Amino acid sequence: MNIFEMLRIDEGLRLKIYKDTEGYYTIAAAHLLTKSPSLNAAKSELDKAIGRNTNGVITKDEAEKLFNQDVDAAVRGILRNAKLKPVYDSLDAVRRAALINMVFQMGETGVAGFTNSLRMLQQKRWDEAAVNLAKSRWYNQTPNRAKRVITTFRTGTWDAYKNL
């Protein structure tokens, strides 16, 4: 288990264009292509990223290239952010994976807004951090995923991703 397996489980890896929970065309691991209702616009943005006429279907290798880049962006966003960086520096490897998972799902700005929970995580108060996170809007939206990520922050282990 590592950050890539973790995200593959929570996000999945689609090889064909699919619709977001808001109707947005997407692919790979929650990789936004376009916000317009036009499939053509979706297919066109995919081809510029891939470099060929995908017609809405890509290979595993291409899907994982997109995935790898997005995971790299999430990690960059953390290191360039004044609030995330110090928390990330203080976490062990497993909990770091949980921080990356959140940034990847919500973006560096969104996660940076959890100022209390972050301070909690920095001071190593796992149990309090978990309870505080459990009553967020994020948790309410995606219960199963948020529970797995919270459990990871709490325990410092991968049990929530091994017992499925």
Side-chain angles (χ1 to χ4, degrees), residues 41-129:
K43 288 182 170 171
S44 160
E45 286 298 297
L46 183 57
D47 297 354
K48 288 182 183 310
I50 299 308
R52 65 179 179 73
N53 172 57
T54 68
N55 194 53
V57 191
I58 59 173
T59 69
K60 179 188 180 53
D61 300 45
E62 300 168 322
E64 298 186 325
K65 188 196 194 66
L66 289 189
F67 184 35
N68 261 65
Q69 292 166 34
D70 297 331
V71 169
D72 235 55
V75 175
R76 235 80 58 54
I78 286 170
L79 300 171
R80 90 175 73 165
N81 199 286
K83 289 180 174 44
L84 303 183
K85 168 74 157 59
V87 182
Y88 184 92
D89 284 328
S90 70
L91 302 186
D92 51 81
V94 186
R95 294 194 169 89
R96 280 174 162 164
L99 193 52
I100 293 168
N101 185 307
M102 282 180 79
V103 172
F104 183 106
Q105 177 185 191
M106 302 179 278
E108 72 160 53
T109 301
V111 182
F114 293 75
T115 51
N116 295 339
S117 300
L118 285 179
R119 181 195 61 223
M120 287 191 247
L121 291 173
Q122 186 161 51
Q123 296 175 175
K124 297 191 177 300
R125 298 187 180 187
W126 320 123
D127 290 326
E128 287 127 277

Side-chain angles (χ1 to χ4, degrees), residues 1 23 34-35 37 59 64 81 91-92 98 112 117 133 152 159 164:
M1 190 60 49
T34 183
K35 287 186 177 176
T59 69
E64 298 186 325
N81 199 286
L91 302 186
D92 51 81
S117 300
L133 294 175
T152 298
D159 295 325
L164 299 184

